[PDB]
Amino acid sequence: MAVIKVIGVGGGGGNAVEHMVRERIEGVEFFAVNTDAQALRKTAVGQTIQIGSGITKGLGAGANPEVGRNAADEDREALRAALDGADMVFIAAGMGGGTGTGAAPVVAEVAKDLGILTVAVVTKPFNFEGKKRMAFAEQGITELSKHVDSLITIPNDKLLKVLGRGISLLDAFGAANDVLKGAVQGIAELITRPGLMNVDFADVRTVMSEMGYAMMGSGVASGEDRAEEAAEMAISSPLLEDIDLSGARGVLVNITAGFDLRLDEFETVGNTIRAFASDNATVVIGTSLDPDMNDELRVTVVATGIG
Amino acid sequence: SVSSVPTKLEVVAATPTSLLISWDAPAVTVSYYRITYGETGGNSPVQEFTVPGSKSTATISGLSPGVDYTITVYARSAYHRRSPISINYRT
Ligand SMILES: Nc1nc2c(ncn2[C@@H]2O[C@H](COP(=O)(O)OP(=O)(O)O)[C@@H](O)[C@H]2O)c(=O)[nH]1
Known part of the structure; x- marks a missing residue:
């Protein structure tokens, strides 16, 4: 009877949730939330939610955390009705992006005001991702903190210790799908299994x-x-x-x-x-x-x- | 493209009573492998053993010649819960 929802916020958030949907987490509901309308149909999540019918023209807020936050702040009603009736929400987002860094703290604030248990699971960018991207993801995590019960941070630089040599970009990236999934699957399954x-x-x-x-x-x-x-x-x-x-x-x-x-x-x-x-x-x-x-x-x- | 780990799996040496299977090196560190094999369509409980995660081969011994077999390799990693790969073999 408990209702668990997982929200893939952003492009890489929806990546991880698409992988949780394919690999199955039992007894949860998966949502995908992003500005990019193109990639928001090229995913078989089943619940698609674009933030900003207007503030964005279905394009993508590239590396854009300002209007990514605004894009979210423009349909705080679209978010609320997909949330309603949740006991627990997982917000899975790739930090340091655009649409994911600004919406995830907005997404989290709505669920918090609905009295939903709000756990955010998010990834700090790599090395090869650079210093503008990583310092982005600090401002998201400190904006996210003010609107969550619990904020699990996983820094992607930790993965390069278990990632072999010659693994591609795609390898380093499905690997970060899995740590997000494990963080959701290891919590939710106390409830579901x-x-x-x-x-x-x-x-x-x-x-x-x-x-x-x-x-x-x-x-x-x-x-x-x-x-x-x-x-x-x-x-x-x-x-x-x-x-x-x-x-x-x-x-x-x-x-x-x-x-x-x-x-x-x-x-x-x-x-x-x-x-x-x-x-x-x-x-x-x-x-x-x-x-x-x-x-x-x-x-x-x-x-x-x-x- | 392929969702499982390991992503490839083949028999590389094949007598009629023992097999050397081989799989790809994982992008992400495996702790150990679960290896299971039974006759394709059987009521007997599958046999299974573990090899260290450093391995990319396994010897399945004591097989029945000309008998059809289904082999499954699970990669157990602390970093994921990925799904296994599988193959079928005769002799
Ligand atoms: N696990 C995972 N992480 C991603 C993915 N895409 C991007 N990331 C991470 O998220 C950061 C920004 O990418 P992205 O989420 O697409 O930007 P945004 O969607 O506009 O917020 C990068 O530094 C990546 O490390 C993905 O498909 N899967």
Whole structure:
């Protein structure tokens, strides 16, 4: 009965959501939001929303965060009616662009005023993307912060540590689809595919509402040490590198396994987490169930209220 | 273009009872591979094992000659949840 919506804001936001739509996230609703009307039909999302029938002529706000923000501020009604009835919204945007940097904080402000739990998941641009683009994405993230419960930042420069040599631009870019997707799929699935130690929506609102800056990390592992090792990969993740795990106001943990999860594996994940987090922090550890999983484990960690 | 990881998969050495499969090098670091194989259309539970993520080959031994088989390789990476690739083989 919970309603989860994911909003791909911008050109690269709609890229990631198109990939979440193709790869399927279970029990959520996907929307695509952009100024570029051309690429807003050349996507099989199913819910298309162009911001600015007028303020833009169906063209694209190229590297344009000024009228990208204005383009959004011109149909704050088109946004509101697609939002209505949501318990939770995911705003997935490529930061440092034009249309995505200005609309995402507007999109987030509407959902916040409708009382929707607003999580923004956004990507800091690369190196080869340059310094005008990256400093763009700082002004978006600080404008986004003033209108979200939780803001997960993933800096794309972290991906070049796991991206091999000779990978193309397209490679470096579907890779950033996946970190956005994982950040949405590892949160939503506590709600949509809950396991036998469940995290309901209220537990989620608590770790994540009015909390601000957030960061996340994931691990997989199989065999006899899958729990110790997946946890170590998640606490050690580079996407989480910049953060004193101990300094977050909250930690949300999602153990994704499939039935054969041992009582003392849950032990292991829990105590590892409890050691690297503050004894006062809102610590929420539960599982999601994937029956198609056997002898392998996945752990997802999101550290909230890091700011 | 191709959504899965690994994106390519072929048998590269093929006796009648054992196979050396091979797949492409991933753009993104794989932790380990899940490798499953069964007779195409079977009620027996598929067999599966893991090879380190550094590998791009796998030996499936103990096969029945002239028997039709479906092989599946999952790449497990902490960076994605990408979908597997699959192929079919006889002998
Ligand atoms: N994951 C992903 N990121 C993208 C994509 N396109 C662009 N980005 C990132 O977003 C930034 C701006 O691109 P874009 O989102 O298209 O600009 P905008 O849509 O006008 O806001 C770039 O620095 C890229 O790093 C995409 O298709 N997928």
